[PDB]
Amino acid sequence: AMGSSPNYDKWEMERTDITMKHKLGGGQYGEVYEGVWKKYSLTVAVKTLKEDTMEVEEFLKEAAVMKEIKHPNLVQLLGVCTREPPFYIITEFMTYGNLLDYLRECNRQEVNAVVLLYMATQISSAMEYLEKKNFIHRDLAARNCLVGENHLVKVADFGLSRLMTAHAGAKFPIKWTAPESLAYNKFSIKSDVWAFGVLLWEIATYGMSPYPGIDLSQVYELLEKDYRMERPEGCPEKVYELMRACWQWNPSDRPSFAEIHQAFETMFQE
Ligand SMILES: Cc1ccc(NC(=O)c2ccc(CN3CCN(C)CC3)c(C(F)(F)F)c2)cc1OC1CCN(C(=O)c2cccnc2)CC1
Numbered sequence: 001a002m003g004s005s006p007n008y009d010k011w012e013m014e015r016t017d018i019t020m021k022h023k024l025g026g027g028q029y030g031e032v033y034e035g036v037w038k039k040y041s042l043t044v045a046v047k048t049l050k051e052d053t054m055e056v057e058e059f060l061k062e063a064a065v066m067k068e069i070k071h072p073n074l075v076q077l078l079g080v081c082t083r084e085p086p087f088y089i090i091t092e093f094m095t096y097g098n099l100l101d102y103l104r105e106c107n108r109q110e111v112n113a114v115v116l117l118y119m120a121t122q123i124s125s126a127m128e129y130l131e132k133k134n135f136i137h138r139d140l141a142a143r144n145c146l147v148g149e150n151h152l153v154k155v156a157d158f159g160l161s162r163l164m165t166a167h168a169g170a171k172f173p174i175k176w177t178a179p180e181s182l183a184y185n186k187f188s189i190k191s192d193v194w195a196f197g198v199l200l201w202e203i204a205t206y207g208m209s210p211y212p213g214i215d216l217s218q219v220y221e222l223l224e225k226d227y228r229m230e231r232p233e234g235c236p237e238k239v240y241e242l243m244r245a246c247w248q249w250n251p252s253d254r255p256s257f258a259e260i261h262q263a264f265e266t267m268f269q270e
């Protein structure tokens with residue numbers, strides 16, 4: 001080791017081997033960059049921090065959790081540089097970028113209703129895995145999902161949410177946040193389930209904004225009154241039923257991600 005210690009972390013990579021390219025989205029997505037891992041001529045994505053102003057503890061924790069996560073539908077950690085600044089987390093680069101823009105911009109003949117269902121199933125799978133691990137995503141939404149080759153979809157976290165092609169709701173995603181989370185700041189797997197229902201709606205609509213035309217300040221009250229978004233055109237009724245289950249007021253009454261993944265397989269008869 002450079003530090004002369006016998007402790008080591010295999011994930012820690014040499015920063016000299018990374019070439020830092022342009023910020024993704026030209027800065028709309030925070031401190032995330034395209035980069036090249038020169039050793040493999042491999043395009044990669046790199047997240048960094050600005051440490052004087054940012055929470056280093058949170059970054060280190062993020063790096064740590066990512067080391068524990070392996071699934072086909074979860075973004076793949078490649079390495080970290082977390083001994084000293086600048087701090088980096090390095091992941092795979094997903095060719096087609098975030099799901100929200102992809103839905104908005106896609107050819108609907110290719111990306112038809114069936115493909116939308118496939119995207120949902122893939123996300124369901126990822127969430128089932130996180131649930132088993134007892135990890136809470138805390139910011140599930142289309143903007144945080146990624147699209148790869150072969151219509152592959154992965155759950156990720158850009159890290160923009162501040163809750164303690166614009167994407168206006170990225171910082172304060174009130175429209176994705178369960179009522180208990182809003183009122184009492186309780187975030188849980190069950191609150192992720194609520195968000196998942198919103199994400200299903202985003203998918204079903206090809207990326208429309210939720211609760212269209214409704215002010216942020218009126219969302220909680222509407223939910224409390226037992227109002228919910230309507231079934232999208234072309235959304236299968238069974239999928240809508242699932243969304244509605246995800247949006248039960250009491251968290252206890254929402255399905256588990258295990259049940260949700262099971263429902264998808266079963267629901268259309270096989
Ligand atoms: C560079 C980078 C580093 C780390 C991350 N971190 C994660 O995605 C991430 C972090 C924590 C976690 C999990 N935690 C989430 C927070 N919870 C409180 C705890 C659990 C996850 C996941 F939910 F998937 F398990 C993902 C994302 C990063 O960048 C993202 C994903 C990769 N990117 C692309 O593939 C990309 C995006 C847009 C255009 N081109 C490529 C860029 C944006």
Ligand SMILES: Cc1ccc(NC(=O)c2ccc(CN3CCN(C)CC3)c(C(F)(F)F)c2)cc1OC1CCN(C(=O)c2cccnc2)CC1
Nearest residue numbers: 162163164172174179182183184216217218219220221224
């Ligand atoms: C942009 C925004 C829009 C709406 C809301 N919240 C609500 O509309 C809302 C939430 C709970 C509630 C209801 N609760 C009010 C509080 N009671 C203890 C429980 C019931 C209501 C309402 F009063 F109408 F019923 C409304 C919060 C919003 O933002 C806050 C900013 C501060 N928050 C932060 O996480 C935060 C704080 C400090 C630094 N960074 C983020 C929480 C989200």
Ligand SMILES: [Cl-]
Nearest residue numbers: 050051052053
């Ligand atoms: Cl800084």
